[PDB]
Symmetry: D2
Subunit: 277 residues, 4 copies
Amino acid sequence: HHHEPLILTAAITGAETTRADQPNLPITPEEQAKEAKACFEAGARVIHLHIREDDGRPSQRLDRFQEAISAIREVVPEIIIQISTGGAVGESFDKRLAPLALKPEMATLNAGTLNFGDDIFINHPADIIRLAEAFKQYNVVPEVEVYESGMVDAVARLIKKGIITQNPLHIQFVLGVPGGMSGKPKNLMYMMEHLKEEIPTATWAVAGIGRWHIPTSLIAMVTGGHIRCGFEDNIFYHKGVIAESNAQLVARLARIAKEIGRPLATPEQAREILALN
Amino acid sequence: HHHEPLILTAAITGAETTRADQPNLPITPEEQAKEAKACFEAGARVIHLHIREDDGRPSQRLDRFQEAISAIREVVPEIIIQISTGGAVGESFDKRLAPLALKPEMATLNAGTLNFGDDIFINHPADIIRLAEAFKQYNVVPEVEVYESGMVDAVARLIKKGIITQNPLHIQFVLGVPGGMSGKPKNLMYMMEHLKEEIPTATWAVAGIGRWHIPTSLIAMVTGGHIRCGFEDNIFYHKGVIAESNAQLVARLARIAKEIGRPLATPEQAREILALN
Amino acid sequence: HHHEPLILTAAITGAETTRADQPNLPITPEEQAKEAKACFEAGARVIHLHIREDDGRPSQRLDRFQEAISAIREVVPEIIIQISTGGAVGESFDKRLAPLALKPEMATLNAGTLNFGDDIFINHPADIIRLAEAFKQYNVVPEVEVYESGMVDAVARLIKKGIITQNPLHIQFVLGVPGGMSGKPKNLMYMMEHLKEEIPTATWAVAGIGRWHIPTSLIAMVTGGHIRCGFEDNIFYHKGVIAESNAQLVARLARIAKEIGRPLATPEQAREILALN
Amino acid sequence: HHEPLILTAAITGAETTRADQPNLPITPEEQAKEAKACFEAGARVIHLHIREDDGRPSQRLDRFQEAISAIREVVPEIIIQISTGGAVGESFDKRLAPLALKPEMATLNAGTLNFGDDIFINHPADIIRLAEAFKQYNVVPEVEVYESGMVDAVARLIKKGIITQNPLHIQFVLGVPGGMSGKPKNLMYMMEHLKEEIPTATWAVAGIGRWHIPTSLIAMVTGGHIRCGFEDNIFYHKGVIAESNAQLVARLARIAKEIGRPLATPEQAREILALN
Ligand SMILES: C[C@H](N)CC(=O)CC(=O)O
Ligand SMILES: C[C@H](N)CC(=O)CC(=O)O
Ligand SMILES: C[C@H](N)CC(=O)CC(=O)O
Ligand SMILES: C[C@H](N)CC(=O)CC(=O)O
Ligand SMILES: [Mg+2]
Ligand SMILES: [Zn+2]
Ligand SMILES: [Zn+2]
Ligand SMILES: [Zn+2]
Ligand SMILES: [Zn+2]
């Protein structure tokens, strides 16, 4: 339904994107804060946050996460800061889990292992359980990341076992990873229906990597889904035309939502939908 | 694919819409010409044409069709004028077929019978064959209208029997009629896949009646489909806000196509895709 | 789920099938009673009944329907006798409605109009309402016949208007009619999912005409659906091999259900599922 | 439901235990006896894992040769497909080496996934190494797919010329805890997804545990081929342990006979799977 409020998430930095490809990539807490302000003004209500060292290397340092979180909340106190527990491929699970200790409002929870480009993004079943238990210990709301159909079933089993008790649960379909399910329209339609069958009360969002950004976004617009965009997932505005800011990508989605009459969620509505109150 | 040229059709008048509900409805040839020019400038490449008497009653008069066609050609000679052979529900089949004698570039060919609101839109199998023979007699390219899954199979059988020889064939999915298949995303995805299985070389467009205009349009945008809009099908710009003009509906679709980088077909490209050149 | 009880319906005679193609076709009430007993023993719990005159002509005579109903009830009182309100294409709606006055446990209710072979099977919206009101008047439970996606929506609107109050409602997908939706696996999967979305509490069965009998039956077996078989819909046991009787077609489905461990509904369970108690 | 049906019997596997399934064939002679009964019941392919006498999964070349020779002797016409999957946690080097035995066919796992409490690892560089060995040893692969994304990954290996097999045989392995389930919606989605991404590919389905019956009956009427057996499912009915792999094969053959779908002859199975 294209009248339910739309939540836009900006995945502004990520762990893979470089300035070789996207020179406008925000790397420092100050750059991330400036980008978060422009994204919030463009319509984003959530920042999906990865941090980097000054040299651009991915980081898991708690004091660096605090620096970025502080800089963003000082410029836009209303935005929801969602910490990544995914980090860079190959990072140790202990370093990935530890920032839950900063007690953010929300953080991601990756629901399975998959080949990821030339490497493997590992989420051992015992570590998924350890992380789900840590979400309860640190009192953080999860965004559950799903890259394949089978990950929805795996999450439904963790719900049945009482390991994931978050209700309503927010699921993010991450489509277009080389090794994961693509963002073709048939796949997004299949995933939302599959999720409705297996976890009927779950809410959902979609992140369309690269070329899949536009097809996933426009389908989510008219099916009641929420949308993630940003340099972490896609650096192009048009084929061969880099976007000049994460805010440009957010603003296009907000303009399309305005065209079709789908309202953007207020910060209050975004916290209500995602059960962050 | 959202890189293939987009053909926008404006169904500007129709047989059911009234001036009482939509005061901006073009009824006279002069009003239809003014609307067609504004629609073409907004991005439309096809006008789906029904005619009316000055009092708003649906008409099948050949002089009135000639007047509307000439008035539109006078101000926008590049637009494709597609005559309706559907007309008003209950109209005699003889009166529905006769305007093909005007040798338009294109005309609609309804592929089956269905309950339509409180009445029945009748297309007897023998009359569908008579109409297909008249299209060939007057060298008119059809737009085959389908309202249900079974109409695709019925068209595939007419192709197998050598009754429909148009190649490539252009199919329009008309979704949202009370009595026909709705325009929900699941249905449009099903129909394009069903059509690919049964008539692999067919091209397609979608008309989303009323509330289905936005979901059908945005799915067609990113799946390579073409789109029909207009007062015949939908009088609202937003929920509860009746639109200013057909051009206002066309312009929104053109702006969304520009946002996502899907080019609008030139008149030459539209004629090539629809095999009118 | 392939463990919920399976209801088998035998459509033993119909209005189209001839003795010239199928010499085992039961035509008289005595032949229909003998067939119904053999079908019940093979696993059928419902008889879908059309009647014929002694010369094989389709009939709508109430005395002839009473004779067939009484003959079947005398030899197999546990079977559910479902009378057809569809009859032969082109029959008057008054003659089609009249047998509801015999107060059968169940009867079919055709939910829309469609081209049917070279003719049109007409179900005017006002007549569908008249029929649905007559079902309630005579305390007859309907089996709602749907041939296309749009007919599910039309039934959902009759439920919303309080015209169809039957809860749970039993829908039968009639697939493979020339002019209607085919019985290909994609279509049956689409229809059960479409029905779950639009009428969530409805139960369903499938009738796969001719070549579609086996694909529809095996999909329904493992998706919790119920199945109709019989000479009305298909006269062949294998491609080009005429069946010996309706009981032969029923027995195969019962054997497949036994193989996979799906229990056959007892007469008591069939009446509970179809809300005939 | 008229195109010939190929039935594969996955008779042993690496996970199933004798305690849960006392009829589990473990030794080459037990595997040969089972393969003969399966062939007579309608199987045209044996999906083979080997075990040591103590039931532990094995990768020993002499043990694979013993099992292959024993099966070959009792049923020469059956297609022996060796597993390159082996047991979860087995080294990739040990998993690849049996291709040197030049079997008629072997499995090629197309991706990594969580698998029960562990992870079934197929590193992208190892998938490439394995696909290259298939070409060098002139072995026809059966490509194992557990998720939608693995179809796309296989399409990319075809584009890169790493997989040159044409037509390519894909097996959907559905119902693994961690992988895509075998519900009817999923099998319908996968066959359509495969037709879109690899149009000339043929396919089979393996429905683990509770998914055996739904996957089998959908494949029966959609032209797909079917895998059954103790590796994937030990029950004949819910809570009723199966008596042999041949019992599971025979049920599928009886259902195929009921609906008039012919079973592939050994010659037809080799033609469809391009083993000639
Ligand atoms: C492998 C990806 N960099 C992990 C990721 O970005 C998902 C998350 O943020 O939780
Ligand atoms: C019954 C419909 N008003 C006929 C119609 O509008 C379709 C067409 O133009 O061909
Ligand atoms: C026109 C159809 N032969 C009528 C029919 O057989 C459907 C029903 O029984 O309700
Ligand atoms: C993890 C499974 N035991 C590996 C397997 O059985 C797949 C194959 O045979 O190629
Ligand atoms: Mg005049
Ligand atoms: Zn991330
Ligand atoms: Zn029209
Ligand atoms: Zn009938
Ligand atoms: Zn295996």
